[PDB]
């Protein structure tokens, strides 16, 4: 029937459980929130901000067109915004 772990319905109706997790769950929620609200998520992953898909008078896609220079090409495009 069972393998000796504590049943879930016993865990989540327990006071100790909710004493820990009413802290851990909101804290994680706020952590992920801050991950975005600080702009850090943009910078870690390289995702364009709404103002940095194109340069002001550009309408070309900054498409990677080289395999081994591809890192340098992305960096070139990103300068053409600064």
């Amino acid at each position: 029937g069972t393998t000796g772990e504590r049943p879930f319905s016993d865990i989540i109706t327990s006071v100790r459980y909710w004493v820990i997790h009413s802290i851990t769950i909101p804290a994680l929620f706020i952590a992920g929130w801050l991950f975005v609200s600080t702009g850090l998520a943009y910078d870690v992953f390289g995702t364009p901000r709404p103002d940095s898909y194109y340069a002001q008078e550009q309408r070309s896609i900054p498409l990677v067109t080289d395999r081994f220079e591809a890192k340098q090409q992305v960096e070139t495009f990103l300068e053409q915004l600064k």
């Binding site: 016993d10 989540i12 006071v15």
Partner: peptide, 10 residues
């Protein structure tokens, strides 16, 4: 043990 009733958790 079973303090917080399950219907309320749900």
């Amino acid at each position: 043990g079973g303090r917080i009733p399950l219907w309320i958790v749900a």
